[PDB]
Design an enzyme around this catalytic site. Structure first.
Site, PDB file in Angstrom:
ATOM      1  N   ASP B 139       0.831  -1.196   0.000  1.00  0.00           N
ATOM      2  CA  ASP B 139       0.000   0.000   0.000  1.00  0.00           C
ATOM      3  C   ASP B 139       0.874   1.257   0.000  1.00  0.00           C
ATOM      4  O   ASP B 139       2.039   1.202   0.349  1.00  0.00           O
ATOM      5  CB  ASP B 139      -0.901  -0.032   1.238  1.00  0.00           C
ATOM      6  CG  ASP B 139      -1.944   1.055   1.235  1.00  0.00           C
ATOM      7  OD1 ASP B 139      -1.889   1.951   0.374  1.00  0.00           O
ATOM      8  OD2 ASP B 139      -2.828   1.019   2.108  1.00  0.00           O
ATOM      9  N   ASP B 200     -10.953   2.549  -2.910  1.00  0.00           N
ATOM     10  CA  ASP B 200     -11.433   1.344  -2.246  1.00  0.00           C
ATOM     11  C   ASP B 200     -12.853   1.014  -2.671  1.00  0.00           C
ATOM     12  O   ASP B 200     -13.502   1.774  -3.396  1.00  0.00           O
ATOM     13  CB  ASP B 200     -11.375   1.514  -0.736  1.00  0.00           C
ATOM     14  CG  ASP B 200      -9.985   1.810  -0.264  1.00  0.00           C
ATOM     15  OD1 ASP B 200      -9.081   1.060  -0.680  1.00  0.00           O
ATOM     16  OD2 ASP B 200      -9.783   2.776   0.500  1.00  0.00           O
TER      17      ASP B 200
HETATM   18  O1  LIG Z   1      -5.717   0.461   5.612  1.00  0.00           O
HETATM   19  C1  LIG Z   1      -5.618  -0.480   4.543  1.00  0.00           C
HETATM   20  C2  LIG Z   1      -6.287   0.014   3.252  1.00  0.00           C
HETATM   21  O2  LIG Z   1      -5.433   1.042   2.680  1.00  0.00           O
HETATM   22  C3  LIG Z   1      -5.936   1.598   1.443  1.00  0.00           C
HETATM   23  O3  LIG Z   1      -7.117   2.286   1.682  1.00  0.00           O
HETATM   24  C4  LIG Z   1      -6.187   0.489   0.407  1.00  0.00           C
HETATM   25  O4  LIG Z   1      -6.761   1.042  -0.763  1.00  0.00           O
HETATM   26  C5  LIG Z   1      -7.102  -0.615   0.942  1.00  0.00           C
HETATM   27  O5  LIG Z   1      -7.230  -1.689  -0.002  1.00  0.00           O
HETATM   28  C6  LIG Z   1      -6.524  -1.143   2.252  1.00  0.00           C
HETATM   29  O6  LIG Z   1      -5.319  -1.858   2.000  1.00  0.00           O
END
Ligand SMILES: OC[C@H]1O[C@H](O)[C@H](O)[C@@H](O)[C@H]1O
Ligand SMILES: *[C@@H]1O[C@H](CO[C@@H]2O[C@@H](C)[C@@H](O)[C@@H](O)[C@@H]2O)[C@@H](O[C@@H]2O[C@H](CO)[C@@H](O[C@@H]3O[C@H](CO[C@H]4O[C@H](CO)[C@@H](O)[C@H](O)[C@@H]4O)[C@@H](O)[C@H](O[C@H]4O[C@H](CO)[C@@H](O)[C@H](O)[C@@H]4O)[C@@H]3O)[C@H](O)[C@H]2NC(C)=O)[C@H](O)[C@H]1NC(C)=O
Ligand SMILES: *[C@@H]1O[C@H](CO)[C@@H](O[C@@H]2O[C@H](CO)[C@@H](O[C@@H]3O[C@H](CO[C@H]4O[C@H](CO)[C@@H](O)[C@H](O)[C@@H]4O)[C@@H](O)[C@H](O[C@H]4O[C@H](CO)[C@@H](O)[C@H](O)[C@@H]4O)[C@@H]3O)[C@H](O)[C@H]2NC(C)=O)[C@H](O)[C@H]1NC(C)=O
Ligand SMILES: *[C@@H]1O[C@H](CO)[C@@H](O[C@@H]2O[C@H](CO)[C@@H](O[C@@H]3O[C@H](CO[C@H]4O[C@H](CO)[C@@H](O)[C@H](O)[C@@H]4O)[C@@H](O)[C@H](O[C@H]4O[C@H](CO)[C@@H](O)[C@H](O)[C@@H]4O)[C@@H]3O)[C@H](O)[C@H]2NC(C)=O)[C@H](O)[C@H]1NC(C)=O
Ligand SMILES: *[C@@H]1O[C@H](CO)[C@@H](O[C@@H]2O[C@H](CO)[C@@H](O[C@@H]3O[C@H](CO)[C@@H](O)[C@H](O)[C@@H]3O)[C@H](O)[C@H]2NC(C)=O)[C@H](O)[C@H]1NC(C)=O
Ligand SMILES: *[C@@H]1O[C@H](CO)[C@@H](O[C@@H]2O[C@H](CO)[C@@H](O[C@@H]3O[C@H](CO)[C@@H](O)[C@H](O)[C@@H]3O)[C@H](O)[C@H]2NC(C)=O)[C@H](O)[C@H]1NC(C)=O
Ligand SMILES: *[C@@H]1O[C@H](CO)[C@@H](O[C@@H]2O[C@H](CO)[C@@H](O)[C@H](O)[C@H]2NC(C)=O)[C@H](O)[C@H]1NC(C)=O
Ligand SMILES: OC[C@H]1O[C@H](O)[C@H](O)[C@@H](O)[C@H]1O
Lengths: 390, 391
Positions: B139, B200
């Site tokens: 991420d 997301d």
């Molecule tokens: O906190 C974890 C999240 O961080 C981002 O929002 C990402 O897009 C998500 O898929 C998840 O991994």
């Protein structure tokens, strides 16, 4: 409208949302709006015991009429889609123990484009009255100023009582005054068994959210003028279709019950999930919505993607809703002070709460100090019913 | 990333959407993110035959880590929620025959607030590599400029290949290039097995609609760079939860298949509808998405609240989607020229179409001339598969 009708939220079916204005009885003869369609439906309501559960009104919405008045100047159903004519239709409907309802429009045209009713009210009224109608959905598309509007609704209202036939009159009056001026609901209520407030309703979660969000953000004016004879009407029940998730369906049902709202399905009862029909007919939930008291519920709390609704019932009993407005994640848990619930009353000192949804479970007794906890699924709703130890 | 991995869209489970960042193992232990939970999940995937259907990757997302490094300096799972570090859990995961995946962040912090990875890449890599990891979700929350970003992704990428452990590397790089400049995807693809593109995903119809529309209106740049080794990744599969209606679930599944997208569920496989699990495991649909060819589908038509998608498969066979974007009413009917479908090819001369969704029915033979008609439910989707022949 004190006509001794709708002393309880009206229960029935309305073809609109599920069939809209379909006319191609060529390539689509089953979705097509015809006496054949309803006639079928009517049979069913009786079959799978819909009638038994409460739904007793089968109603036609826009697009049931032929292009124009007859030599006499009264309306007429489309010749091809309604060859035998309403009257006779009605008689079958009655033969089957149900009551029929028809759609009409105050202005120069129905939202469909078909015949209006402007300067025909009296005629039309007698017409329906003679056709053997039991309920009228008076829509308001096409008209100069509220003058023509307000008067039309009011006028027609009187025309009917005059006919002598007991006709549940369902207005859409309010929905049109906005956004020119807040309506005088006390007024309207003296002319309707129930009226529309917000836009139509899609087979979608969004459309529902907005309506709640709207009825939530307005209780001041509406929630009050609600009671026997006149009700606040959200729109049809789209449960049994496709746009709603499971937990989204229980929600609508749970909340329409909280908002003493008219119960009108808009689904094809021929092809409807068993799981759905179960909900739609839940004796205990229909009972709540059908409460004799006629006290419309309302949102109590806001915050933390959580909404708390509640409606006082009869016999010191209260209905309560728990909506998890959190679109993502899983089932969260909400906890509140049993006491500060039924305005402090219900639960003083004892309370008997039986989860009535989504699983009708028998929770124990609750003391005024007892604190209630429960988990709620995303976009779902937990409906409760409280009894006071008296 | 040509590491001989993800020569097919990766298939697995990711706790995110269904469990987010839940830590209250006191009053919310079932949603609580702990090794205990993953162990359960692992067991199941094997039980109700998820593994058999294809899902083979069980992955941890943000919030699996303790507050900060240790004396040495490496990363350490939360002491309380992950008493047995990782390694051991990976053995239980590996035991069941599955592969484990962990979440990490390029910047100073994970989107959760926990330890980053900035200036630790190498260390961390070896760490995981040691721990016995099979997949990494990298991420990108928290970092100065793309300089630190781009480099970090790139850097880490190499760090892993170096460790020697075969690790499917799943980037989120792109999702973070905007608002700066449309991504050199040819570049990225030389560093990832698959990357994120859009925000997301909620357990909602809306969130899905936007992703389709968004993806629909971008194929130019993405649809192309898709193929073995590197894939375009929409997000987890929220089927089996609550936000989606039935017609809405088939849609996501049908379309992820069309968009050779990674298949990652985010549901509780314990409390999952039978009707759901059925769809999630449909052999014929997984097959389409798992097509060896690796040719990502795309929207063909627009208009009238109707969307027509299609992906060429292997052996002159084509997959086709039919979405009814009409939120109200009932099931409408759509009809098209069998011919002007598979770019003209599939259906020349004969086309054997077998509805593969929502009810896998066996439609007859179709000639080139042939006219195919079908009804589609609101917010629903009818998935078809055309094979070429000559009866
Ligand atoms: O906190 C974890 C999240 O961080 C981002 O929002 C990402 O897009 C998500 O898929 C998840 O991994
Ligand atoms: C993670 O957080 C790190 C911490 O940085 C944040 O900001 C600082 C001030 C604290 O508040 C901290 O708590 C915050 O988190 C962050 O590290 C920082 O990274 C930047 C980029 O490298 C550094 O800025 C640069 O500073 C130099 C001065 O010394 C640096 O370079 C020399 C030689 O290369 C090294 O030996 C030093 O260790 C430093 O790295 C500046 O020269 C340069 O500024 C330019 O512009 C100014 C403005 O006029 C000129 O004066 C200069 O001459 C330059 O032309 C950079 O700004 C920063 O020093 C560093 N912080 C620390 C404490 O080391 C890191 O970037 C974050 N990670 C991510 C991915 O974002
Ligand atoms: C044109 O407009 C006039 C003007 O209103 C209408 O007149 C009304 O006619 C109805 C017809 O029955 C009358 O309704 C009766 O009201 C009684 C009053 O009690 C009410 O209030 C108590 C306490 O709040 C409640 O318990 C009760 O439910 C009522 O809400 C009722 O006692 C009557 O109920 C009886 O009949 C029903 C039906 O069989 C039984 O189930 C009951 O047990 C009971 O025996 C009844 O509801 C109303 O009072 C009249 N009002 C006025 C102002 O005249 C005309 O009806 C209308 N014409 C047409 C064609 O619609
Ligand atoms: C670090 O990075 C390197 C560089 O990419 C990785 O090495 C690659 O590993 C993959 C894994 O298989 C190799 O991919 C395979 O290539 C075979 C052809 O090899 C020729 O072509 C490549 C590409 O240019 C040349 O590098 C190589 O010299 C050969 O001339 C294909 O035949 C493979 O598919 C078929 O064969 C395989 C192998 O038996 C079967 O499993 C398949 O089912 C199929 O039949 C496949 O595409 C790739 O060639 C390697 N490239 C290089 C440069 O080495 C390292 O793996 C990576 N290290 C770590 C620890 O991650
Ligand atoms: C909304 O419409 C209602 C219905 O008319 C209005 O209520 C009614 O208002 C009239 C005044 O226009 C009241 O008349 C008065 O009656 C009393 C005795 O009851 C008399 O002493 C006065 O001289 C006068 O005639 C009427 O009672 C009242 N009825 C009810 C049931 O409330 C209301 O005013 C309208 N709202 C607004 C904001 O205008
Ligand atoms: C995206 O990044 C890639 C590489 O990361 C860039 O592509 C590179 O483009 C150059 C040409 O500008 C290629 O080099 C060529 O090499 C041959 C010899 O083989 C030479 O004769 C040519 O003159 C040329 O220099 C290079 O191979 C190529 N790299 C890859 C991996 O394909 C690309 O420019 C970037 N895209 C954008 C839009 O910036
Ligand atoms: C239906 O349409 C007619 C014609 O456009 C409207 O009648 C006009 O009413 C105005 C007053 O608002 C008069 O000044 C005109 O002379 C009328 N014209 C005609 C041809 O009658 C009528 O009011 C409309 N009905 C509604 C309910 O708005
Ligand atoms: O034209 C038919 C429609 O007209 C209005 O929009 C009304 O609110 C709808 O429920 C339906 O009756």
């Amino acid at each position: 409208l004190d006509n001794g009708l709708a002393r309880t939220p009206t229960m029935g079916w309305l073809h609109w949302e599920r069939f809209m204005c379909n006319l191609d009885c060529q390539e689509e003869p089953d979705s097509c709006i015809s006496e054949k369609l309803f006639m079928e439906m009517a049979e069913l309501m009786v079959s799978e015991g819909w009638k038994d559960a409460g739904y007793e009104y089968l109603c036609i919405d826009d697009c049931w009429m032929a292009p124009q008045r007859d030599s006499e100047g009264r309306l007429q159903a489309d010749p091809q889609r309604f060859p035998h004519g309403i009257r006779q239709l009605a008689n079958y409907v009655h033969s089957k123990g149900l009551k029929l309802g028809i759609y009409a429009d105050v202005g120069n045209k129905t939202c469909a484009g078909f015949p209006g009713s402007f300067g025909y009210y009296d005629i039309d009224a007698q017409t329906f009255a003679d056709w053997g109608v039991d309920l009228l959905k008076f829509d308001g598309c096409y008209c100069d100023s509220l003058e023509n509007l307000a008067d039309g609704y009011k006028h027609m209202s009187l025309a009917l009582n005059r006919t002598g036939r007991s006709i549940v009159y369902s207005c859409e009056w309010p929905l049109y005054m906005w956004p020119f001026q807040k309506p005088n609901y006390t007024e309207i209520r003296q002319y309707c068994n129930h009226w529309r407030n917000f836009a139509d309703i899609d087979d979608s979660w969004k459309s529902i959210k907005s309506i709640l969000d709207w009825t939530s953000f307005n209780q001041e004016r509406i929630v009050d003028v609600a009671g026997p004879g006149g009700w606040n009407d959200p729109d049809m029940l789209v449960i049994g279709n496709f746009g709603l998730s499971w937990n989204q369906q229980v929600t609508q049902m749970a909340l329409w019950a909280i908002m003493a709202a008219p119960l009108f399905m808009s689904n094809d009862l021929r092809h409807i999930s068993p799981q759905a029909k179960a909900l739609l007919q839940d004796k205990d939930v229909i009972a709540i919505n059908q409460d004799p008291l006629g006290k419309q519920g309302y949102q109590l709390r806001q915050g933390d993607n959580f909404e708390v609704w509640e409606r006082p019932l009869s016999g010191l009993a209260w209905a309560v809703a728990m909506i998890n407005r959190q679109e993502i994640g899983g089932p969260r848990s909400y906890t509140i002070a049993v006491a500060s619930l039924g305005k402090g009353v219900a639960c003083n000192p004892a309370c008997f709460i039986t989860q009535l949804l989504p699983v009708k479970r028998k929770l124990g007794f609750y003391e005024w100090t007892s604190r209630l906890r429960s988990h709620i699924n995303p976009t779902g709703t937990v409906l409760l019913q409280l009894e006071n130890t008296m």
